[PDB]
Amino acid sequence: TGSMVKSGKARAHTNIALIKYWGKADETYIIPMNNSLSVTLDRFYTETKVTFDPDFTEDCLILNGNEVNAKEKEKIQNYMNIVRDLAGNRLHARIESENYVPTAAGLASSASAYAALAAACNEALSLNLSDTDLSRLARRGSGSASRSIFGGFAEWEKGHDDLTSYAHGINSNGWEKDLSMIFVVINNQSKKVSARSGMSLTRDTSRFYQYWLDHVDEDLNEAKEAVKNQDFQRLGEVIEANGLRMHATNLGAQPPFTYLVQESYDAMAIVEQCRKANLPCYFTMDAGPNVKVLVEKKNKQAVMEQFLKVFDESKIIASDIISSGVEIIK
Ligand SMILES: Nc1ncnc2c1ncn2[C@@H]1O[C@H](COP(=O)(O)OP(=O)(O)OP(O)(O)=S)[C@@H](O)[C@H]1O
Ligand SMILES: O=C(O)C[C@@](O)(CF)CCOP(=O)(O)OP(=O)(O)O
């Protein structure tokens, strides 16, 4: 609000990978081993304001109304260095961010977080970045954030370097408007292996990683053709298989691990029962036990009702798919 003070605020929505990003070719720049395909969710998002002021001497992150720890403080300061290099300036920022994402329920916040921050910085400093360069900037903070620049279906092109690795939105003739995702919240323990660490151990040591690589391009192609034709069953079958293959890779790591628990398998079983009961739907899982169930909007209520026979109402949470991308807000 004062002169010499530059601020910007953005809202960016989370996204869920249907064809998985799993393993980095370049750990420092976050370049992936394979392309990925995601859908951006309407219900869950991060709002982030950044304020650059010549009088600030270091960057500060206030998250959900509270100061972050020294660890997170260091992480955010290193990311802002990237931003300062891009902008050609030396200004430090006060960052105030709120996650509107059920993180206690295990949903991931890094995709919306880094997409929001990149967009906020772009607005604050008038960088005039293209969506491509916003995607590249967000990517540097978290790989999945590259995709949250966009709404609906989005694809992260792996590229081969910092300049070529980024996402773009896929037009699906408005198909995203007909689809929903139900989150089945499942309890794990022993603290989670972050996606970054897990995928690193797997990419580095898994005896089944080559199997993943040999099939991921075929899956992505199949999925994209399914999107062109708005063929729900065809999309579902391939993404469900792809998700399972990603978890298979962890089983081959040295030593093996899994994100899935018996309750996860219970939820998958319910999805298959829904399919056999003329209620088409398909599941996927990320770096934890939650099961995400892709379903057509017309069937959302019904599928949820099947889950509600078994799971607490608090643990069944649905979202539609949003069509628009990252937003600049007040
Ligand atoms: N609004 C935010 N602004 C800045 N950083 C955030 C924000 N929200 C979450 N983070 C950071 O996101 C990191 C978490 O990412 P992860 O450990 O990979 O798990 P996650 O929260 O599910 O995000 P993913 O899995 O990577 S999409 C935390 O270290 C936070 O510091
Ligand atoms: O989102 C997907 O494609 C699949 C996953 O969510 C499944 F676990 C991986 C997310 O990776 P990410 O959180 O980006 O780790 P980072 O790049 O080290 O920050």
Side-chain angles (χ1 to χ4, degrees), residues 17 19-22 24 30 36 110 141-144 147 195-196 199 246 286-287:
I19 298 288
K20 307 298 199 192
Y21 151 49
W22 197 243
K24 299 180 174 58
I30 305 188
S36 62
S110 85
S142 176
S144 52
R147 301 178 311 243
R196 186 164 298 183
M199 74 169 73
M246 195 212 81
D286 296 315

Side-chain angles (χ1 to χ4, degrees), residues 122-181:
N122 179 59
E123 168 59 34
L125 300 172
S126 297
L127 294 179
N128 289 307
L129 295 179
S130 60
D131 285 346
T132 286
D133 290 342
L134 274 172
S135 187
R136 293 178 49 236
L137 175 57
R139 193 200 78 240
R140 296 282 305 273
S142 176
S144 52
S146 66
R147 301 178 311 243
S148 285
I149 299 304
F150 309 95
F153 291 87
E155 180 185 3
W156 179 9
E157 160 62 40
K158 64 179 187 190
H160 57 91
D161 67 8
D162 177 64
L163 276 161
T164 52
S165 194
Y166 56 82
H168 64 266
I170 294 171
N171 184 343
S172 66
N173 298 319
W175 195 28
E176 78 279 340
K177 306 166 186 175
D178 297 323
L179 306 172
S180 293
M181 176 161 299

